[PDB]
Amino acid sequence: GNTTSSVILTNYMDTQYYGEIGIGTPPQTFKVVFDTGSSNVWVPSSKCSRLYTACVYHKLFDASDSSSYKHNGTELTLRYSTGTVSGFLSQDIITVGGITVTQMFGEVTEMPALPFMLAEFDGVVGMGFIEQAIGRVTPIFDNIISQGVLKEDVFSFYYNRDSLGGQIVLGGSDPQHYEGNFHYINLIKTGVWQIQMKGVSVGSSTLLCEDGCLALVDTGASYISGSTSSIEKLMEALGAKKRLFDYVVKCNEGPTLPDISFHLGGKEYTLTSADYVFQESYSSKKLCTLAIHAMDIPPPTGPTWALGATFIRKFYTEFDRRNNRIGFALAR
Ligand SMILES: COCCCCn1c(C(=O)N(CC(C)C)[C@@H]2CNC[C@H](C(=O)N3CCOCC3)C2)nc2ccccc21
Ligand SMILES: *[C@@H]1O[C@H](CO)[C@@H](O)[C@H](O)[C@H]1NC(C)=O
């Protein structure tokens, strides 16, 4: 086709970027993360027991208020690295950036308070491949492609550093939010937004991923992550202290921290301390969190690094389904 369309995103505290979709007739609105690290659509269900407090606080899809609903009822569980939701499949019309698509999605009936009470978003729109889709449910971008409306089989992510929170372009990219040329890196394989990485360096020292490793480009993740052993080494190099869920440095040390570079497609993608430290103070008596942590992702996807919002804030990212590649450009 000829259409480009966009979804405007909100940036909650540089950690959660979400847009709004409509589901049903008339449209029920949900806040959703657009997640290249997964392939299912879900939102919380009116069938969710209210003993799940996360279903009390989030927007619930009520099938009984939608005239375009089509029951399916197959039960599915989506296991994320951060937690699990379960429920059942339904079909309805989803509106996303003014594109209406008939989509099979999860109605979540089991939604654990940890972590989902910490989600500003209600649900997830998986932007990954059908190969990753639980229940082999056709992902929404595949269904959008099938309509022949988009000028290209691509979508692009801008995540703002100011917390316009962000923008996803369906069918292209937005030159207003990047500059210079795209650097295009081929996927290891179709089915996952994962590329080869050939080094993680602290300063001039390539102390990790020397023999090569994987990098998942995960728009649904807040941080940069790697395996526990990888991240422990990295954090030992930075002089960072491990806590339960994050690593920290004394805030005064934040600006002294070295650059971290990811060797992707023959180039060094470099984050400075400003890109990865939540510099909330300059006090030697406060602790400042790093936007880098351990996520152990089991095979076949992992072990793998994952380049989340921390990375994407700096690097405008085009996801190219036509050519099975990811393009990076400098975000502005
Ligand atoms: C950039 O803005 C969105 C940041 C959301 C970060 N966040 C995650 C989170 O990081 N994820 C899930 C979620 C999308 C459901 C990621 C999304 N990408 C897929 C990964 C994942 O499960 N894997 C395992 C399989 O391989 C790919 C990475 C989980 N869980 C959360 C719970 C409460 C609050 C915030 C949470
Ligand atoms: C749910 O979807 C599957 C796959 O399309 C289909 O075979 C099945 O019959 C559906 N079930 C119901 C109850 O509609």
mmCIF file of C-alpha atoms and ligand atoms in Angstrom:
data_model
loop_
_atom_site.group_PDB
_atom_site.id
_atom_site.type_symbol
_atom_site.label_atom_id
_atom_site.label_comp_id
_atom_site.label_asym_id
_atom_site.label_seq_id
_atom_site.Cartn_x
_atom_site.Cartn_y
_atom_site.Cartn_z
ATOM 1 C CA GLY A 1 0.000 0.000 0.000
ATOM 2 C CA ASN A 2 0.921 3.636 0.643
ATOM 3 C CA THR A 3 0.013 4.122 4.331
ATOM 4 C CA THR A 4 2.417 4.968 7.111
ATOM 5 C CA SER A 5 0.864 5.206 10.532
ATOM 6 C CA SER A 6 2.130 6.039 13.994
ATOM 7 C CA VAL A 7 1.400 5.263 17.602
ATOM 8 C CA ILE A 8 2.275 8.001 20.055
ATOM 9 C CA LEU A 9 3.904 6.726 23.191
ATOM 10 C CA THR A 10 4.031 7.923 26.758
ATOM 11 C CA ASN A 11 7.392 7.673 28.573
ATOM 12 C CA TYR A 12 6.891 6.777 32.240
ATOM 13 C CA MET A 13 10.165 7.597 34.058
ATOM 14 C CA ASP A 14 12.451 6.349 31.238
ATOM 15 C CA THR A 15 11.477 2.785 32.157
ATOM 16 C CA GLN A 16 8.072 2.133 30.577
ATOM 17 C CA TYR A 17 7.032 3.262 27.127
ATOM 18 C CA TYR A 18 3.508 2.525 26.088
ATOM 19 C CA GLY A 19 0.849 3.586 23.600
ATOM 20 C CA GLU A 20 -2.883 3.204 23.399
ATOM 21 C CA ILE A 21 -4.879 0.708 21.404
ATOM 22 C CA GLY A 22 -8.621 0.218 21.035
ATOM 23 C CA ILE A 23 -10.150 -3.261 21.295
ATOM 24 C CA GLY A 24 -13.762 -4.057 20.466
ATOM 25 C CA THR A 25 -16.819 -2.257 19.263
ATOM 26 C CA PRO A 26 -17.076 0.324 20.615
ATOM 27 C CA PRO A 27 -13.342 0.527 21.233
ATOM 28 C CA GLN A 28 -12.172 -0.149 24.777
ATOM 29 C CA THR A 29 -8.861 1.620 25.261
ATOM 30 C CA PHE A 30 -5.737 0.018 26.713
ATOM 31 C CA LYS A 31 -2.236 1.158 27.448
ATOM 32 C CA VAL A 32 0.165 -1.308 25.908
ATOM 33 C CA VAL A 33 3.851 -1.913 25.558
ATOM 34 C CA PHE A 34 4.908 -2.642 21.998
ATOM 35 C CA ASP A 35 7.281 -5.496 22.599
ATOM 36 C CA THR A 36 9.693 -6.822 19.939
ATOM 37 C CA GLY A 37 10.797 -9.403 22.529
ATOM 38 C CA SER A 38 7.445 -11.252 22.337
ATOM 39 C CA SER A 39 4.736 -12.018 19.774
ATOM 40 C CA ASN A 40 1.362 -12.212 21.609
ATOM 41 C CA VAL A 41 -1.181 -9.508 22.229
ATOM 42 C CA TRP A 42 -2.843 -9.464 25.608
ATOM 43 C CA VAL A 43 -4.777 -7.209 27.894
ATOM 44 C CA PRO A 44 -6.348 -7.862 31.299
ATOM 45 C CA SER A 45 -9.791 -9.467 31.188
ATOM 46 C CA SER A 46 -13.038 -8.626 32.967
ATOM 47 C CA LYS A 47 -12.871 -12.399 33.818
ATOM 48 C CA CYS A 48 -9.761 -11.782 35.926
ATOM 49 C CA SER A 49 -10.519 -12.578 39.563
ATOM 50 C CA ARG A 50 -10.303 -9.310 41.521
ATOM 51 C CA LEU A 51 -8.130 -11.097 44.062
ATOM 52 C CA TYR A 52 -5.510 -10.147 41.475
ATOM 53 C CA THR A 53 -5.101 -6.571 42.593
ATOM 54 C CA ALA A 54 -3.399 -5.797 39.267
ATOM 55 C CA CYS A 55 -6.784 -6.463 37.631
ATOM 56 C CA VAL A 56 -8.403 -4.046 40.076
ATOM 57 C CA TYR A 57 -5.945 -1.288 39.045
ATOM 58 C CA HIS A 58 -5.706 -1.936 35.307
ATOM 59 C CA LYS A 59 -8.147 -1.516 32.516
ATOM 60 C CA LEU A 60 -10.050 -4.731 31.844
ATOM 61 C CA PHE A 61 -11.349 -5.873 28.459
ATOM 62 C CA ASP A 62 -15.009 -6.715 28.731
ATOM 63 C CA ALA A 63 -16.084 -8.980 25.852
ATOM 64 C CA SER A 64 -19.661 -8.523 26.998
ATOM 65 C CA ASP A 65 -19.408 -4.815 25.950
ATOM 66 C CA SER A 66 -18.062 -5.591 22.462
ATOM 67 C CA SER A 67 -20.374 -6.322 19.546
ATOM 68 C CA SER A 68 -17.416 -7.459 17.381
ATOM 69 C CA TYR A 69 -16.102 -10.037 19.866
ATOM 70 C CA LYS A 70 -15.554 -13.605 18.714
ATOM 71 C CA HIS A 71 -15.101 -16.201 21.443
ATOM 72 C CA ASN A 72 -12.296 -18.719 21.312
ATOM 73 C CA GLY A 73 -11.473 -19.664 24.905
ATOM 74 C CA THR A 74 -8.239 -21.631 24.366
ATOM 75 C CA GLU A 75 -6.202 -21.234 27.555
ATOM 76 C CA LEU A 76 -2.667 -19.878 27.240
ATOM 77 C CA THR A 77 0.121 -18.825 29.551
ATOM 78 C CA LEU A 78 2.726 -16.237 28.582
ATOM 79 C CA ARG A 79 5.950 -16.652 30.539
ATOM 80 C CA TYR A 80 8.044 -13.520 30.407
ATOM 81 C CA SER A 81 11.445 -13.221 32.011
ATOM 82 C CA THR A 82 9.873 -10.813 34.541
ATOM 83 C CA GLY A 83 6.660 -12.715 35.313
ATOM 84 C CA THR A 84 3.748 -14.636 33.928
ATOM 85 C CA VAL A 85 0.226 -13.950 32.783
ATOM 86 C CA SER A 86 -2.387 -16.495 31.956
ATOM 87 C CA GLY A 87 -5.857 -16.457 30.515
ATOM 88 C CA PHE A 88 -7.580 -17.399 27.286
ATOM 89 C CA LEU A 89 -7.792 -16.437 23.645
ATOM 90 C CA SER A 90 -10.354 -14.138 22.119
ATOM 91 C CA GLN A 91 -10.756 -12.362 18.837
ATOM 92 C CA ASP A 92 -11.855 -8.801 18.253
ATOM 93 C CA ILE A 93 -11.116 -5.702 16.216
ATOM 94 C CA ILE A 94 -8.010 -3.869 17.414
ATOM 95 C CA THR A 95 -7.362 -0.267 16.470
ATOM 96 C CA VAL A 96 -3.671 0.655 16.490
ATOM 97 C CA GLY A 97 -2.564 3.996 15.006
ATOM 98 C CA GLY A 98 -5.817 4.288 13.021
ATOM 99 C CA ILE A 99 -5.340 0.812 11.478
ATOM 100 C CA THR A 100 -8.141 -1.634 12.343
ATOM 101 C CA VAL A 101 -7.210 -5.312 12.321
ATOM 102 C CA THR A 102 -9.069 -8.469 13.377
ATOM 103 C CA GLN A 103 -6.703 -9.913 15.941
ATOM 104 C CA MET A 104 -6.552 -12.913 18.200
ATOM 105 C CA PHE A 105 -5.352 -11.822 21.641
ATOM 106 C CA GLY A 106 -5.125 -12.980 25.229
ATOM 107 C CA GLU A 107 -7.687 -12.043 27.805
ATOM 108 C CA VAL A 108 -5.549 -12.238 30.967
ATOM 109 C CA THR A 109 -7.360 -13.716 33.955
ATOM 110 C CA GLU A 110 -4.294 -14.325 36.137
ATOM 111 C CA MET A 111 -2.063 -11.328 36.565
ATOM 112 C CA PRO A 112 0.356 -11.458 39.557
ATOM 113 C CA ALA A 113 0.580 -8.279 41.664
ATOM 114 C CA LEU A 114 4.354 -8.557 41.491
ATOM 115 C CA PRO A 115 5.288 -7.466 38.920
ATOM 116 C CA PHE A 116 2.089 -6.191 37.345
ATOM 117 C CA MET A 117 1.134 -3.658 40.034
ATOM 118 C CA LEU A 118 4.323 -1.915 38.901
ATOM 119 C CA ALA A 119 3.133 -1.747 35.279
ATOM 120 C CA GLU A 120 1.742 1.609 34.179
ATOM 121 C CA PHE A 121 0.654 -0.255 31.019
ATOM 122 C CA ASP A 122 -2.353 -2.609 30.977
ATOM 123 C CA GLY A 123 -1.077 -5.112 28.419
ATOM 124 C CA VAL A 124 1.327 -5.953 25.630
ATOM 125 C CA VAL A 125 1.353 -5.902 21.858
ATOM 126 C CA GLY A 126 4.028 -8.377 20.760
ATOM 127 C CA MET A 127 5.976 -7.153 17.721
ATOM 128 C CA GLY A 128 7.961 -10.354 17.314
ATOM 129 C CA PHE A 129 7.543 -13.176 14.878
ATOM 130 C CA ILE A 130 4.869 -15.885 14.696
ATOM 131 C CA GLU A 131 7.642 -18.430 15.496
ATOM 132 C CA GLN A 132 7.747 -16.921 19.050
ATOM 133 C CA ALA A 133 3.952 -16.677 19.432
ATOM 134 C CA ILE A 134 2.500 -18.823 22.195
ATOM 135 C CA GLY A 135 -0.258 -20.909 20.623
ATOM 136 C CA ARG A 136 1.072 -19.945 17.147
ATOM 137 C CA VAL A 137 -1.355 -17.002 17.197
ATOM 138 C CA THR A 138 -0.795 -14.697 14.192
ATOM 139 C CA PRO A 139 0.903 -11.585 15.576
ATOM 140 C CA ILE A 140 -0.682 -8.200 14.962
ATOM 141 C CA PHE A 141 2.024 -6.877 12.605
ATOM 142 C CA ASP A 142 1.643 -9.993 10.404
ATOM 143 C CA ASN A 143 -2.102 -9.333 10.332
ATOM 144 C CA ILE A 144 -1.475 -5.657 9.470
ATOM 145 C CA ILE A 145 0.970 -6.723 6.691
ATOM 146 C CA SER A 146 -1.716 -9.051 5.275
ATOM 147 C CA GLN A 147 -4.022 -6.055 4.677
ATOM 148 C CA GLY A 148 -1.547 -4.524 2.180
ATOM 149 C CA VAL A 149 -1.954 -0.977 3.578
ATOM 150 C CA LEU A 150 1.617 -0.291 4.769
ATOM 151 C CA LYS A 151 4.118 1.022 2.241
ATOM 152 C CA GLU A 152 6.820 -1.172 3.788
ATOM 153 C CA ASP A 153 6.974 -4.368 5.842
ATOM 154 C CA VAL A 154 8.810 -2.469 8.610
ATOM 155 C CA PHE A 155 8.152 -0.652 11.851
ATOM 156 C CA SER A 156 10.314 1.784 13.806
ATOM 157 C CA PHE A 157 10.755 2.843 17.426
ATOM 158 C CA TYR A 158 11.633 6.222 18.864
ATOM 159 C CA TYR A 159 11.861 6.361 22.653
ATOM 160 C CA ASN A 160 12.312 9.904 23.971
ATOM 161 C CA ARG A 161 14.881 10.745 26.649
ATOM 162 C CA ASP A 162 12.455 13.273 28.183
ATOM 163 C CA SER A 163 9.979 11.688 30.635
ATOM 164 C CA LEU A 164 6.278 13.257 23.084
ATOM 165 C CA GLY A 165 7.288 10.147 25.101
ATOM 166 C CA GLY A 166 7.942 8.173 21.956
ATOM 167 C CA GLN A 167 6.660 7.022 18.611
ATOM 168 C CA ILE A 168 6.279 3.806 16.679
ATOM 169 C CA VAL A 169 5.952 4.164 12.922
ATOM 170 C CA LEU A 170 4.111 1.318 11.239
ATOM 171 C CA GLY A 171 5.258 1.036 7.634
ATOM 172 C CA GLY A 172 8.446 3.102 7.753
ATOM 173 C CA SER A 173 10.496 5.467 9.881
ATOM 174 C CA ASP A 174 10.254 9.091 10.922
ATOM 175 C CA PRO A 175 13.233 11.262 9.795
ATOM 176 C CA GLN A 176 12.222 13.834 12.460
ATOM 177 C CA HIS A 177 13.499 11.457 15.179
ATOM 178 C CA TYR A 178 16.750 10.190 13.685
ATOM 179 C CA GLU A 179 19.725 11.563 11.852
ATOM 180 C CA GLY A 180 22.407 10.262 9.570
ATOM 181 C CA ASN A 181 22.220 6.876 7.915
ATOM 182 C CA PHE A 182 20.764 3.661 9.214
ATOM 183 C CA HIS A 183 23.236 0.915 9.982
ATOM 184 C CA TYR A 184 21.496 -2.330 8.994
ATOM 185 C CA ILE A 185 22.329 -5.570 10.812
ATOM 186 C CA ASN A 186 20.953 -8.928 9.653
ATOM 187 C CA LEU A 187 19.104 -11.184 12.072
ATOM 188 C CA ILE A 188 20.822 -14.421 13.129
ATOM 189 C CA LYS A 189 17.594 -16.081 11.954
ATOM 190 C CA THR A 190 14.021 -15.187 11.083
ATOM 191 C CA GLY A 191 11.707 -15.692 14.099
ATOM 192 C CA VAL A 192 13.447 -13.494 16.669
ATOM 193 C CA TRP A 193 14.636 -9.865 16.691
ATOM 194 C CA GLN A 194 18.116 -11.043 17.642
ATOM 195 C CA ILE A 195 21.473 -10.106 16.130
ATOM 196 C CA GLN A 196 25.052 -11.192 16.571
ATOM 197 C CA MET A 197 27.178 -9.238 19.011
ATOM 198 C CA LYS A 198 30.979 -9.516 18.934
ATOM 199 C CA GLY A 199 32.073 -7.712 22.084
ATOM 200 C CA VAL A 200 30.963 -5.742 25.087
ATOM 201 C CA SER A 201 33.622 -3.241 26.088
ATOM 202 C CA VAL A 202 34.137 -1.092 29.151
ATOM 203 C CA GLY A 203 36.284 1.836 28.007
ATOM 204 C CA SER A 204 38.814 0.403 25.521
ATOM 205 C CA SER A 205 38.723 -3.101 27.116
ATOM 206 C CA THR A 206 36.583 -5.792 25.456
ATOM 207 C CA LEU A 207 36.066 -7.865 28.613
ATOM 208 C CA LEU A 208 32.822 -9.591 27.515
ATOM 209 C CA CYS A 209 31.368 -11.430 24.527
ATOM 210 C CA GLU A 210 34.872 -11.936 23.106
ATOM 211 C CA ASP A 211 33.865 -15.120 21.227
ATOM 212 C CA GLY A 212 30.551 -13.624 20.107
ATOM 213 C CA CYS A 213 27.144 -13.716 21.714
ATOM 214 C CA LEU A 214 23.518 -12.821 21.017
ATOM 215 C CA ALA A 215 21.733 -9.507 21.405
ATOM 216 C CA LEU A 216 17.947 -9.409 21.405
ATOM 217 C CA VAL A 217 16.657 -5.934 20.475
ATOM 218 C CA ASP A 218 13.770 -5.747 22.952
ATOM 219 C CA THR A 219 11.542 -2.675 22.775
ATOM 220 C CA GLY A 220 9.502 -4.110 25.660
ATOM 221 C CA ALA A 221 12.446 -4.102 28.083
ATOM 222 C CA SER A 222 13.465 -1.130 30.249
ATOM 223 C CA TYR A 223 17.159 -1.821 30.494
ATOM 224 C CA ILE A 224 20.142 -3.408 28.924
ATOM 225 C CA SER A 225 20.451 -6.955 30.194
ATOM 226 C CA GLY A 226 22.793 -9.889 29.924
ATOM 227 C CA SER A 227 23.255 -13.153 31.785
ATOM 228 C CA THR A 228 23.960 -13.035 35.511
ATOM 229 C CA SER A 229 27.605 -14.074 34.969
ATOM 230 C CA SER A 230 28.080 -11.521 32.156
ATOM 231 C CA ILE A 231 26.472 -8.727 34.167
ATOM 232 C CA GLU A 232 28.378 -9.573 37.365
ATOM 233 C CA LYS A 233 31.660 -9.237 35.404
ATOM 234 C CA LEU A 234 30.499 -5.984 33.794
ATOM 235 C CA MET A 235 29.461 -4.581 37.181
ATOM 236 C CA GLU A 236 32.716 -5.649 38.818
ATOM 237 C CA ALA A 237 34.458 -3.661 36.058
ATOM 238 C CA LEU A 238 32.256 -0.590 36.792
ATOM 239 C CA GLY A 239 32.672 -0.889 40.606
ATOM 240 C CA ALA A 240 28.891 -1.172 41.002
ATOM 241 C CA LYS A 241 27.119 -2.767 44.007
ATOM 242 C CA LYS A 242 24.570 -5.522 43.440
ATOM 243 C CA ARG A 243 21.192 -5.185 45.125
ATOM 244 C CA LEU A 244 18.119 -7.480 44.950
ATOM 245 C CA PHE A 245 16.870 -6.181 41.550
ATOM 246 C CA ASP A 246 19.350 -3.551 40.341
ATOM 247 C CA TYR A 247 22.956 -2.458 40.461
ATOM 248 C CA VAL A 248 23.952 0.860 41.955
ATOM 249 C CA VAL A 249 26.887 3.195 42.311
ATOM 250 C CA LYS A 250 27.374 6.067 44.699
ATOM 251 C CA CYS A 251 25.765 8.960 42.787
ATOM 252 C CA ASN A 252 28.926 11.060 42.869
ATOM 253 C CA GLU A 253 30.705 8.233 40.946
ATOM 254 C CA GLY A 254 28.018 8.166 38.215
ATOM 255 C CA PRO A 255 29.731 10.731 35.952
ATOM 256 C CA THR A 256 33.134 8.995 36.375
ATOM 257 C CA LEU A 257 31.811 5.724 34.922
ATOM 258 C CA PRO A 258 33.353 4.542 31.636
ATOM 259 C CA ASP A 259 31.661 4.122 28.280
ATOM 260 C CA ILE A 260 30.120 0.774 27.536
ATOM 261 C CA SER A 261 30.217 -0.326 23.902
ATOM 262 C CA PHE A 262 28.339 -3.066 22.117
ATOM 263 C CA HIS A 263 30.034 -4.359 18.979
ATOM 264 C CA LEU A 264 27.132 -4.826 16.566
ATOM 265 C CA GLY A 265 27.470 -5.381 12.800
ATOM 266 C CA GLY A 266 31.092 -4.230 12.712
ATOM 267 C CA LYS A 267 30.438 -1.034 14.706
ATOM 268 C CA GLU A 268 30.826 0.097 18.302
ATOM 269 C CA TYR A 269 27.464 1.226 19.790
ATOM 270 C CA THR A 270 28.638 3.252 22.745
ATOM 271 C CA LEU A 271 26.629 4.235 25.814
ATOM 272 C CA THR A 272 28.180 6.843 28.091
ATOM 273 C CA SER A 273 27.394 7.073 31.820
ATOM 274 C CA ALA A 274 24.738 9.668 30.976
ATOM 275 C CA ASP A 275 22.948 7.001 28.873
ATOM 276 C CA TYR A 276 22.960 4.277 31.557
ATOM 277 C CA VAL A 277 23.013 5.949 34.983
ATOM 278 C CA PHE A 278 19.858 7.282 36.620
ATOM 279 C CA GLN A 279 21.705 10.357 37.825
ATOM 280 C CA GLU A 280 19.152 11.439 40.475
ATOM 281 C CA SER A 281 21.761 13.106 42.695
ATOM 282 C CA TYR A 282 25.501 13.890 42.818
ATOM 283 C CA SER A 283 25.804 12.961 46.518
ATOM 284 C CA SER A 284 28.393 10.444 47.734
ATOM 285 C CA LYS A 285 25.738 9.457 50.335
ATOM 286 C CA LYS A 286 22.977 8.453 47.846
ATOM 287 C CA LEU A 287 22.895 5.461 45.487
ATOM 288 C CA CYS A 288 22.111 5.827 41.792
ATOM 289 C CA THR A 289 20.655 2.942 39.781
ATOM 290 C CA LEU A 290 22.185 1.706 36.564
ATOM 291 C CA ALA A 291 19.905 0.934 33.576
ATOM 292 C CA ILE A 292 21.662 -2.412 33.185
ATOM 293 C CA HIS A 293 20.802 -5.660 35.026
ATOM 294 C CA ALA A 294 20.865 -9.453 34.828
ATOM 295 C CA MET A 295 18.165 -11.272 32.872
ATOM 296 C CA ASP A 296 18.759 -14.990 32.427
ATOM 297 C CA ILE A 297 16.802 -16.028 29.373
ATOM 298 C CA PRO A 298 16.695 -19.778 28.787
ATOM 299 C CA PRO A 299 17.381 -21.470 25.418
ATOM 300 C CA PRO A 300 16.629 -21.445 22.603
ATOM 301 C CA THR A 301 16.380 -17.588 22.800
ATOM 302 C CA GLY A 302 19.144 -17.295 25.406
ATOM 303 C CA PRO A 303 21.525 -16.986 27.014
ATOM 304 C CA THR A 304 21.417 -13.557 25.407
ATOM 305 C CA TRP A 305 21.945 -9.891 25.930
ATOM 306 C CA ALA A 306 18.905 -7.745 25.433
ATOM 307 C CA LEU A 307 19.007 -4.131 24.283
ATOM 308 C CA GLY A 308 16.005 -2.391 25.838
ATOM 309 C CA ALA A 309 14.853 1.203 26.213
ATOM 310 C CA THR A 310 18.284 2.273 27.519
ATOM 311 C CA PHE A 311 19.745 1.399 24.133
ATOM 312 C CA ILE A 312 16.785 2.485 21.984
ATOM 313 C CA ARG A 313 16.737 5.985 23.521
ATOM 314 C CA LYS A 314 20.098 6.562 21.865
ATOM 315 C CA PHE A 315 19.538 4.484 18.749
ATOM 316 C CA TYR A 316 16.381 4.958 16.705
ATOM 317 C CA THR A 317 15.516 1.426 15.657
ATOM 318 C CA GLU A 318 13.887 0.189 12.475
ATOM 319 C CA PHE A 319 12.641 -3.395 12.467
ATOM 320 C CA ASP A 320 12.635 -4.699 8.906
ATOM 321 C CA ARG A 321 10.473 -7.771 8.282
ATOM 322 C CA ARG A 322 10.969 -7.590 4.496
ATOM 323 C CA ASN A 323 14.738 -8.083 4.816
ATOM 324 C CA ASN A 324 15.048 -9.741 8.294
ATOM 325 C CA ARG A 325 17.283 -6.999 9.610
ATOM 326 C CA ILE A 326 17.391 -4.273 12.188
ATOM 327 C CA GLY A 327 18.458 -0.747 11.306
ATOM 328 C CA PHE A 328 19.999 1.613 13.866
ATOM 329 C CA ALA A 329 20.351 5.357 13.468
ATOM 330 C CA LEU A 330 21.259 8.114 15.950
ATOM 331 C CA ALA A 331 18.036 9.202 17.674
ATOM 332 C CA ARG A 332 17.134 12.885 18.008
HETATM 333 C C1 LIG B 1 9.953 -0.088 27.249
HETATM 334 O O1 LIG B 1 8.749 0.003 28.035
HETATM 335 C C2 LIG B 1 8.268 -1.236 28.573
HETATM 336 C C3 LIG B 1 9.105 -1.695 29.773
HETATM 337 C C4 LIG B 1 8.433 -2.911 30.415
HETATM 338 C C5 LIG B 1 9.451 -3.634 31.308
HETATM 339 N N1 LIG B 1 8.738 -4.695 32.028
HETATM 340 C C6 LIG B 1 8.793 -6.039 31.774
HETATM 341 C C7 LIG B 1 9.597 -6.633 30.677
HETATM 342 O O2 LIG B 1 10.774 -6.338 30.610
HETATM 343 N N2 LIG B 1 9.047 -7.432 29.725
HETATM 344 C C8 LIG B 1 7.616 -7.861 29.736
HETATM 345 C C9 LIG B 1 6.535 -6.764 29.728
HETATM 346 C C10 LIG B 1 6.428 -6.048 28.382
HETATM 347 C C11 LIG B 1 5.217 -7.459 30.093
HETATM 348 C C12 LIG B 1 9.941 -7.970 28.679
HETATM 349 C C13 LIG B 1 9.405 -7.607 27.281
HETATM 350 N N3 LIG B 1 10.177 -8.270 26.220
HETATM 351 C C14 LIG B 1 10.100 -9.726 26.348
HETATM 352 C C15 LIG B 1 10.852 -10.068 27.633
HETATM 353 C C16 LIG B 1 10.996 -11.573 27.755
HETATM 354 O O3 LIG B 1 10.185 -12.166 28.445
HETATM 355 N N4 LIG B 1 11.977 -12.296 27.151
HETATM 356 C C17 LIG B 1 12.020 -13.770 27.353
HETATM 357 C C18 LIG B 1 12.020 -14.452 25.975
HETATM 358 O O4 LIG B 1 13.078 -13.877 25.192
HETATM 359 C C19 LIG B 1 12.933 -12.472 24.936
HETATM 360 C C20 LIG B 1 13.031 -11.720 26.277
HETATM 361 C C21 LIG B 1 10.089 -9.496 28.845
HETATM 362 N N5 LIG B 1 8.014 -6.691 32.601
HETATM 363 C C22 LIG B 1 7.422 -5.814 33.429
HETATM 364 C C23 LIG B 1 6.514 -5.961 34.493
HETATM 365 C C24 LIG B 1 6.074 -4.848 35.167
HETATM 366 C C25 LIG B 1 6.524 -3.571 34.832
HETATM 367 C C26 LIG B 1 7.431 -3.394 33.796
HETATM 368 C C27 LIG B 1 7.879 -4.519 33.085
HETATM 369 C C1 LIG B 2 -9.826 -21.439 18.691
HETATM 370 O O1 LIG B 2 -8.897 -21.227 17.620
HETATM 371 C C2 LIG B 2 -8.365 -22.444 17.063
HETATM 372 C C3 LIG B 2 -7.271 -22.107 16.054
HETATM 373 O O2 LIG B 2 -7.795 -21.223 15.054
HETATM 374 C C4 LIG B 2 -9.508 -23.248 16.440
HETATM 375 O O3 LIG B 2 -9.060 -24.476 15.844
HETATM 376 C C5 LIG B 2 -10.525 -23.562 17.526
HETATM 377 O O4 LIG B 2 -11.636 -24.278 16.972
HETATM 378 C C6 LIG B 2 -11.010 -22.273 18.189
HETATM 379 N N1 LIG B 2 -11.912 -22.666 19.258
HETATM 380 C C7 LIG B 2 -13.146 -22.178 19.437
HETATM 381 C C8 LIG B 2 -13.891 -22.766 20.603
HETATM 382 O O5 LIG B 2 -13.649 -21.313 18.731
#
